[PDB]
Amino acid sequence: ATHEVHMLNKGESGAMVFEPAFVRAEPGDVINFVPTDKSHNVEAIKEILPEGVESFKSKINESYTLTVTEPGLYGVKCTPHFGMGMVGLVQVGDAPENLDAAKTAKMPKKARERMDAELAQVN
Amino acid sequence: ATHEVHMLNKGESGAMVFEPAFVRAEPGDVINFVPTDKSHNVEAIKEILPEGVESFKSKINESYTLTVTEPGLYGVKCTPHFGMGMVGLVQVGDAPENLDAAKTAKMPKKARERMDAELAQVN
Ligand SMILES: [Cu+2]
Ligand SMILES: [Cu+2]
């Protein structure tokens, strides 16, 4: 299955956001990151990645297609707006093995506040 | 401004969901509840409504246009699927005066679990 996530300056939940910021996928699913607004990109938050998945970083203003194979939580951020809280979370499969990494990963306060909000949708 | 919320059987966060389940609006905003899938409706959760706003209930499979004037939290549910957790939350303005009603409103466990997840996006 395919999932679409928009990169927006202003979404339904706030400013500088991935929308939806939380996506529940299954192994083999495709996640398309679409820059609805310019100035955004998507990059993996290395601390929040399943074992065995390579880090990724797209170019600004470009679409990025992420194929999730490994189960676990995938944390993503927008490089220039990490500080302003532009983060997203993808949960592949049940009982994420790296739930505690996601819960304790050190990050800019706004991003940490949004990651926590997203973690509350887990399972 | 206008905000669109879809009623779905299966969304990006789970099954039987309002999507987005959390909308941040300003007084005078319009919220359109669109049944993307059939069998859903939107009805106000009376315990989670600002002072002075009338309760509302739309017919199944119908669109509903909610104009939010009063600031505060507006809780909505899908009548036939309340028990399965199909609830949504709208925050109009800052510092919702009825935040504690939303936090303690008695409701079916799944709905309560989802409401709490949505409350975490508040402010
Ligand atoms: Cu960005
Ligand atoms: Cu429903």
Swiss-Prot record, chains A, B:
Could you tell me which residues belong to the region Disordered?
A: 104-123
Q: Which organism is it from?
A: Paracoccus pantotrophus (Thiosphaera pantotropha)
Any single GO molecular-function term of the entry would be:
electron transfer activity
Location of this chain's protein in the cell = Periplasm
Protein's recorded name: Pseudoazurin
Q: How is the cofactor bound?
A: Binds 1 copper ion per subunit.
Q: Which cofactor does it need?
A: Cu cation
Q: Does the keyword Membrane apply?
A: no
Q: Which portion of the complete protein is shown here?
A: 23 to 145 of 145
